[PDB]
Design a protein around this nucleic acid. Structure first.
Lengths: 426, 218, 1004
DNA sequence: CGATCCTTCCCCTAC
DNA sequence: ATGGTAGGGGAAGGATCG
């Protein structure tokens, strides 16, 4: 490290080279630039020059067990692999669902502060946060370390997950069957939906997950969504004569593109039946199912944005809810409270009016950008007075149609925020 | 080990099979040069010019390269002195002792380390003088360096000024790394490159690093 | 003490110094030695806060340290440029570094020396003999050059000395080796300060028999046995090889102003040094003027071969390490860097240089006499031909048969030469130098007196060709002009690129305007490409075409828009149309158009959809001022050139004007290069955008323009496309043209700095007059500020092949209808160096014939189309069957620059196989004459045997009675492709090619 | 009763 | 010691699907 060893001979490049399996896109472009500049250097020449943009963790896992197999003797730690949107990271970045690079930022500052920067060796190499809808739960880490230590102890230390990682010396090799599986499930003592149990013994990294198929044949009655909160609702499909039948459909409304009504195959283990998401091809029709979902709901709940359109809701109160301030009925009180607030004033001065309104109405990013980019305006006095459509192809998407329908309320809130900003600093 | 017969002095050169596809050409280049090369005394004896030709090239991954043999007491083996008195070898031993921590040095024979081949760009030099056979050994040196660099993985040349255009002399840039000479001269003064970039470059190409401890003599 | 400077050079010893070589009026050479300092620039606080005063310090004054870092903005909240004013100080340190915090560190030490000391590298001065110290005869030492060079005087002429030499060495089969092959002949063209010209050739006597040596001595030659017995006044001298090498060493060790060779750094000087070292062991030693440093010849290499992609390993240059004045110039590198339209073997260097008439006088037997004078073809060419004929042996009068000179006479501004060739009745000729068809290897095996004398004559001819090439290109005047314009030593003007040579005038401008522009953020590399290629409107032009050219468009754009890194107020980007509209509304009001200028640019990133850069036009930035200075001084030098009388002044001014043109033309490219001192991404993009906008404006106003009733009516309103102005916008103007004129106009093609307009007329005089009137009216009325156009030429029979590819005939503006036009091609295959020599002639003839027949068909489109198709098919079939009769030429060229993945690489394998065996040894970066067709490929069925596999190099040999190397009709299908750009009805085109080759020709 | 011709799809080289 | 990206034309060469 005399002359800095050229950043320890590209220590970050080596880390990304060994971390392709648990990396993110920005690191991929950074590594590409690093190899491109390193291949032509007075202190470094050509390298292996391998690139990848897909995040996969199948290398650290084994085949799934689908029958009451037999297990080798030894001490085991049982992990209740839940059913949620898996996230992998090491610090306050990444958290990518196997390819959806930085889809959104979870607003948990306490969680981010609590998580140590590269805890133990390399930050347990990933967190496996299921986040069923919005609840943070940690899971397997595969990283060796020691196991009864920080890796599994982080959940108990910071309260992220209920302590279900405690077991006893098992040994005495026996055939792992339904009875032991149910006994371990009851010993877990959890109410969250669990889909698998992964056993870890001292001295290994890759575990053989077990999952009993129990293929059942059931009919579908209707698909109905139920609201739990602001972006907390789940499209809980109900089949048979009102059965629950769990479906993945986490936050973002994909993998639920199943054919309406008809006959379906489902998987049930002890209490929570789960059907297929995208494995069984069959028909996988999307336009018909999206139109049926929209019609049943009542022309609301645009699919792409995983949210519901603010039909009828003009404004003057949704801004207060978004900014998390006291309820106000007049612009003057809004201005006074924003001035009084220590951080709301900073957050409204730093951000732009367009971004503020877009976040207030909860519109999708790409869809709204495209819809704006295919429209014409009549801006007067820094406010929107008249708008029109130029290309009608983008109207083919129902979500774009709903956003265009509520664009009037969007314009009203945009003008309100512009007036507030003008009255604050001018 | 195959053998070849040349027109001048030793009449017999023994070489390993790894040097097969260039040896003949070397002879075609050597004979003419010999007609003048024996005109003057040289620090290496002619019998030790091609001693390094017996070392196999299949199990070598690091090639350390110099510019010329020692002006006096030419043993034939590059950077070799079985008396711990030459400046370059003692400087390298001191540097490796500082970096690793091994003590009680009685020699640092580099030809016995697995995966590392000691090489000299010019196979001869005038006795008691600097490099004076550059014109004679030019094509032979280029041919031998081209042959070696196609088998080894990393090349480490000693001397910035001497190897200022080492990339131009070789058509294939096979990890050209140029380092300062142990003996500082000609507008240069540097002695500590940490001697560890080679290993990390080796596992950067899915190759086993080389331990810098097999060369110690006790 | 009046002196004129000749060279500035340094020393690479223990202590560095700067040397001046200069000449007085009488002719005495004076050397002056200056200390070599390292210059740093600091603010007042940094200078005062540094404890030990290192060597010296002088004040500068109040200066600004404006920050030129540019960042994108998503709103109109642009604060200001970070600009601070402070007192500055200049620090001199003999050692490498003493500050480590200098603001100005991108400039050279020599530029600082010159500008701070106010010294011009090629100026005439009156030295003061009070700050100089005598240390040795002819040398002085100066410690305070600031006032030692205070007085300047007008230029005065001084004598100079030159040395041109050539070598020839024995070889058996191919390239010689210094260990086994000796030297036979060495020629010298010694020119002294007194002007005496001495030609003399040294011949090796070790390769001759005793009786032949005695015969040579008896018939006029001189024999010597030592250096002291050598006399330069004798042409032919006979001696041993050791004495030859020692004489060469003695000659190269003397202080010549120039030593000019052709490929001498790589071959001649290296061979001489190696052979001298082998035979004796001594060295060729150069010593400094103060007798304190001594070095030897060691030809080193410079591998500066990267034009950011557009080069095949370009070329590696070879230089010598002399520490005296002795400018060692290599014409091989200079010509290679100058012209790229020939082959480099000293056989066709100056063929495309001269044109003169060679009227025949007699046609008897084999002793034809040719004459040449200024009254035949032109002035000057006859004089140059007579000058080069004094040593030539084989003469070319625009014939390709090669003739031997019998008798030569030099008459008053003319020559009379007697050739030896079969008689032939021609009347007019073109005069240029020739080539020698002799076999040196065959001559060396049977060596006798006549062979030695002929070889000596050839060597002296080559040595004199070196001088003739040096004089023809005006290298000395170019060097002086480069030293004057570019603030640099006279010995390094041709060895640096645009990024280095522009730091002198830029430093002068910064010092005079007190600006220290500095960058504090890392640069991001993302090219904007640029495009700007326009698709031609039509393919064939039966009517006439006029050409209008912009006078230095890009410098004028940079001046008009005030595009400098320090004038950019800010750049605004938008990811959506709502914010784009908001920003546009705020921008048209915050920055009024009369003062600020807003330029729309292509988005930097895919998410962005707009990008507007704002420039302030009231502070007179750096780049516009530099370009204005360059243009004004170029105009001044052109006026002085046209007002000068003596030939030397004409040459000097002509040399200066194009150096200023070159320095002005390189700024636009420099603004887009990351490693430049003028780097500005936004400024370069804005310059390209404004250039495109001006081109579009001119094309739109010129399109659809009529000339009815002597009135010039434009299609659209004449308005400034950037902001509103007070100029009239009426699209109808008065013309000083006859009322009877009735014509229409249309724009067909455009370029970066050019516009083509279409006129529905055939006459040339009327077209020229209307073009002049259009130029006047458009310059006075249409354009604005400093944007002027010029009428270049009239293009007839214009044929557009693709984008940036056309062929036509050109009538100059200063010409009439009776003047002869000039054939001009841009991008056509005739300008390519790797197509053919027969193909070019055939396509030229076919293009001319088709142009004539479409000019006068004349029934209609399809009838003339089918007529041309059938006629061309019949002609090409008649010229297809070669009925044996092996023709000449059929030769191609390419550069040996592969240096790529091994694999198979037939082109690399073909060359290296012949190099290792014997014939055609080509170095790296050297073009060679070969003929490639299907390199071991079988595309279809040939006619005879041994046709498709033909890949032999063949340098000068002739193919034997079984090769039959004529199958270039494969590429000749370009005519069919040409028909694509000329006519329709592909059905006839497909059938013929299918019958002959059957490879489904690609239409368009 | 049949295979061809199609365009990318690449490497090399020239403004 | 360093301007620069698109466009054009020749040709292997498996893919193409004939």
């Amino acid at each position: 490290m005399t002359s800095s060893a050229d950043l320890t001979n590209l220590k970050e490049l080596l880390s990304l080279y060994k971390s392709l399996r648990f990396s993110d896109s920005v690191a991929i472009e950074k590594y590409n630039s690093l190899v491109e500049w390193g291949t032509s250097t007075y202190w470094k020449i050509g390298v292996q020059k391998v690139t990848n943009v897909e995040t996969s963790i199948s290398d650290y896992y084994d085949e799934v067990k689908n029958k009451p197999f037999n297990i080798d003797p030894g001490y085991y730690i049982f992990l209740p692999v839940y059913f949620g949107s898996v996230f992998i990271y090491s610090k306050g970045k990444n958290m990518v669902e196997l390819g959806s690079g930085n889809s959104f930022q979870i607003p948990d500052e306490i969680r981010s502060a609590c998580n140590k920067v590269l805890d133990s060796d390399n930050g347990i190499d990933f967190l496996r946060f299921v986040l069923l809808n919005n609840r943070w739960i940690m899971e397997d880490a595969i990283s060796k370390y020691q196991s009864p230590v920080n890796i599994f102890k982080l959940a108990s230390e910071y309260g992220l997950n209920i302590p279900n990682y405690l077991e006893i010396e098992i040994e005495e090799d026996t055939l792992f069957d339904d009875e032991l599986y149910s006994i371990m499930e009851r010993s877990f003592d959890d109410t969250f939906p669990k889909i698998s149990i992964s056993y870890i013994k001292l001295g290994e990294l890759k575990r053989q997950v077990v999952d009993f198929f129990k293929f059942s044949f059931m009919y579908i009655e209707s698909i109905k969504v139920d609201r739990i909160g602001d972006n907390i609702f789940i499209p809980s499909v109900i089949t048979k004569s009102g059965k629950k039948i769990l479906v993945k459909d986490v936050d973002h409304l994909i993998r639920s593109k199943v054919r309406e009504h008809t006959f379906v195959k489902v998987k049930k283990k002890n209490t929570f039946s789960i059907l297929y998401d995208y494995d069984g091809n069959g028909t996988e029709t999307r336009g018909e199912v999206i139109k049926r979902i929209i019609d049943t709901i009542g022309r609301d709940y645009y699919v792409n944005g995983k949210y519901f359109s603010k039909v009828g809701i003009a404004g003057l109160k949704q801004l207060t809810n978004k900014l998390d301030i006291n309820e106000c009925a007049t612009v003057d009180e809004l201005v006074d409270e924003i001035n009084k607030s220590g951080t709301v004033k900073r957050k409204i001065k730093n951000q732009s009016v367009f971004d503020l309104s877009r976040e207030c109405l909860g519109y999708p990013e790409a869809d709204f950008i495209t819809l704006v980019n295919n429209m014409r305006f009549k801006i007067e006095n820094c406010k929107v007075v008249n708008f029109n459509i130029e290309n009608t192809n983008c109207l083919n998407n129902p979500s774009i149609e709903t956003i265009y329908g509520n664009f009037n309320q969007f314009v009203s809130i945009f003008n309100t925020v512009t007036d507030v900003k003008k009255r604050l600093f001018e | 080990m195959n053998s070849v017969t040349i027109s001048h002095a030793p009449y017999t050169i023994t070489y390993h099979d790894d040097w097969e596809p260039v040896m003949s050409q070397l002879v075609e280049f050597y004979n003419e040069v010999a007609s003048w090369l024996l005109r003057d005394e040289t620090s290496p004896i002619p019998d030790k010019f091609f001693i390094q030709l017996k070392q196999p090239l299949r199990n070598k991954r690091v090639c350390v390269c110099g510019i010329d043999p020692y002006p006096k007491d030419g043993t034939g083996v590059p950077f070799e002195s079985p008396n711990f008195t030459k400046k370059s070898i003692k400087e390298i031993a001191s540097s490796i002792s500082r970096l690793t921590g091994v003590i009680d040095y009685k020699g640092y024979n580099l030809n016995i380390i697995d995966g590392v081949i000691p090489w000299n760009y010019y196979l001869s030099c005038k006795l008691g003088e600097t490099k004076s056979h550059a014109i004679y050994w030019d094509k032979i040196s280029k041919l031998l360096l081209q042959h070696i660099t196609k088998h080894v993985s990393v090349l480490y040349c000693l001397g910035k000024t001497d190897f200022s255009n080492i990339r131009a002399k070789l058509e294939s840039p096979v990890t050209t790394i140029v380092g300062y000479h142990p003996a500082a001269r000609d507008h240069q003064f540097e002695k500590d490159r940490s001697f560890e970039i080679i290993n990390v470059l080796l596992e950067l190409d899915n190759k086993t690093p080389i331990n810098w401890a097999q060369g110690f003599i006790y | 003490m009046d002196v004129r400077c000749i060279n500035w050079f340094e020393s690479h010893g223990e202590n560095r110094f700067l040397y001046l070589k200069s000449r007085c009026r009488n002719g005495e050479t004076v050397f002056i030695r200056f200390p070599h300092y390292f210059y740093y620039v600091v603010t007042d606080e940094i200078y005062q806060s540094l404890s030990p005063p290192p060597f010296n310090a002088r004040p500068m004054g109040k200066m600004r340290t404006i920050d030129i870092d540019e960042t994108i903005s998503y709103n109109l909240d642009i604060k200001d440029r970070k600009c601070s004013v402070a007192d500055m100080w200049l620090i001199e340190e003999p050692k490498k570094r003493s500050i480590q915090n200098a603001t100005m560190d991108e400039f050279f030490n020599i530029s600082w020396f010159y500008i701070s000391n106010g010294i011009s590298p090629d100026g005439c001065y009156s030295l003061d003999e009070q700050y100089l110290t005598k240390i040795n005869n002819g040398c002085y030492h100066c410690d305070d050059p600031r006032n030692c060079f205070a007085k300047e005087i007008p230029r005065f002429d001084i004598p100079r000395s030159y040395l041109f030499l050539d070598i020839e060495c024995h070889f058996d089969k191919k390239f010689p080796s210094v260990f086994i092959n000796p030297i036979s002949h060495t020629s010298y063209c010694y020119i002294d300060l007194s002007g005496k010209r001495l030609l003399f050739t040294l011949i090796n006597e070790e390769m001759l028999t005793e009786q032949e040596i005695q015969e040579a001595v008896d018939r006029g030659c001189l024999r010597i046995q030592s250096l002291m017995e050598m006399d330069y006044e004798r042409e032919l001298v006979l001696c041993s090889e050791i004495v030859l090498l020692r004489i060469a060493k003695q000659l190269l060790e003397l202080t010549f102003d120039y030593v000019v060779t052709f490929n001498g750094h790589n071959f001649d000087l290296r061979y001489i040094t190696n052979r001298l070292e082998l035979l004796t062991g001594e060295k060729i030693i150069f010593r400094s003027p103060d007798k304190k440093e001594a070095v030897h010849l060691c030809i080193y290499e410079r591998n500066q071969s990267s034009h950011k992609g557009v080069c095949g390993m370009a070329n590696t240059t070879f230089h010598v390490n002399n520490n005296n004045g002795t400018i060692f110039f290599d014409l091989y590198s200079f010509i290679q860097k100058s012209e790229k339209l020939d082959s480099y073997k000293l056989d066709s260097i100056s063929k495309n240089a001269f044109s003169c008439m060679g009227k025949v006088l007699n046609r008897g037997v084999r002793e034809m006499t040719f004459i040449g004078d200024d009254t035949t073809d032109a002035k000057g060419k006859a004089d140059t031909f007579a000058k080069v004929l004094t040593t030539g042996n084989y003469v070319t009068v625009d014939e390709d048969i090669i003739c031997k000179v019998i008798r030569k006479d030099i008459l008053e501004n003319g020559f009379k030469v007697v050739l030896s060739c079969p008689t032939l009745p021609n009347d007019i000729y073109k005069l240029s130098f020739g080539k020698d068809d002799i076999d040196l290897a065959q001559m060396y095996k049977d060596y006798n007196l006549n062979i030695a004398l002929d070889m000596a004559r050839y060597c002296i001819h080559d040595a004199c060709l070196c001088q003739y090439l040096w004089e023809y290109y005006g290298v000395e005047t170019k060097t002086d002009a480069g030293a004057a314009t570019y603030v640099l030593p006279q010995s390094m003007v041709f060895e640096y690129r645009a990024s280095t040579i522009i730091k002198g005038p830029l430093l002068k401008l910064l010092l005079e305007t007190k600006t220290i522009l500095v960058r504090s953020e890392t640069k991001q590399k993302f090219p904007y490409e640029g495009g700007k290629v326009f698709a031609p409107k039509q393919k064939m032009f039966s009517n006439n075409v006029l050409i209008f050219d912009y006078n230095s468009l890009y410098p004028n754009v940079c001046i008009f828009g005030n595009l400098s890194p320090e004038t950019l107020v800010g750049v605004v980007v938008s990811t959506n149309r709502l914010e784009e509209e908001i920003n546009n509304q705020l921008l048209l009001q915050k920055y009024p158009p009369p003062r600020y200028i807003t330029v729309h640019c292509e988005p930097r990133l895919p998410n962005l959809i707009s990008e507007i850069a704002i420039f302030d036009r009231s502070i007179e930035g750096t780049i516009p001022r530099l370009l204005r200075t360059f243009l004004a001084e170029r105009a001044r030098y052109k006026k002085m050139l046209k007002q000068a009388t003596s030939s030397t002044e004409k040459a000097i001014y002509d040399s200066m004007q194009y150096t200023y043109k070159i320095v002005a033309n390189s700024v636009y490219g420099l603004m887009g290069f990351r490693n430049s001192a003028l780097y500005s991404y936004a400024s370069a993009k804005s310059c390209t955008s404004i250039g495109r906008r001006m081109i579009l404006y001119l094309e739109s106003v010129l399109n659809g323009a009529e000339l009815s009733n002597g009135m010039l009516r434009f299609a659209n309103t004449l308005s400034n496309p950037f902001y509103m102005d007070d100029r009239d916008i009426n699209p109808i103007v008065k013309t000083s043209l006859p009322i009877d004129y009735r014509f229409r106009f249309r724009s067909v093609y455009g370029d970066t700095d050019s516009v083509f307009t279409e006129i529905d007329s055939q006459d040339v005089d009327k077209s020229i007059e209307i073009a002049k009137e259009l130029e006047r009216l458009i310059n006075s009325r249409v354009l604005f500020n400093n944007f002027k156009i010029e009428f270049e030429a009239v293009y007839k029979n214009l044929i557009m092949q693709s984008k940036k590819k056309y062929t036509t005939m050109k009538y100059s503006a200063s010409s009439n209808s009776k003047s002869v036009p000039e054939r001009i091609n841009k991008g056509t295959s005739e300008t390519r160096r790797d197509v053919s020599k027969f193909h070019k002639n055939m396509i030229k003839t076919y293009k001319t014939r088709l142009s004539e027949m479409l000019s006068e068909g004349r029934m209609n489109s399809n009838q003339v189309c089918i007529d041309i198709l059938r006629s061309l098919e019949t002609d090409l079939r008649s010229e297809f069957d070669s009925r044996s009769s092996p023709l000449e030429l059929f030769m191609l060229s390419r550069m040996h620059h592969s240096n790529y993945k091994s694999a198979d690489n037939p082109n690399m394998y073909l060359v290296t196989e012949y190099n290792k065996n014997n014939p055609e040894t080509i170095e790296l970066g050297e073009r060679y004459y070969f003929a490639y067709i299907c390199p071991a490929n079988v595309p279809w069925t040939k006619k005879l045997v041994n046709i498709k596999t033909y890949e032999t190099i063949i340098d000068r040999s002739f193919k034997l009675g079984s090769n039959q190397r004529i199958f270039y009709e494969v590429y000749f299908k370009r005519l069919t492709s040409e028909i694509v750009n000329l006519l329709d009805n592909k059905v006839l085109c497909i059938s013929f090619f299918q019958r002959m080759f059957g490879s489904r020709p690609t239409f368009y």
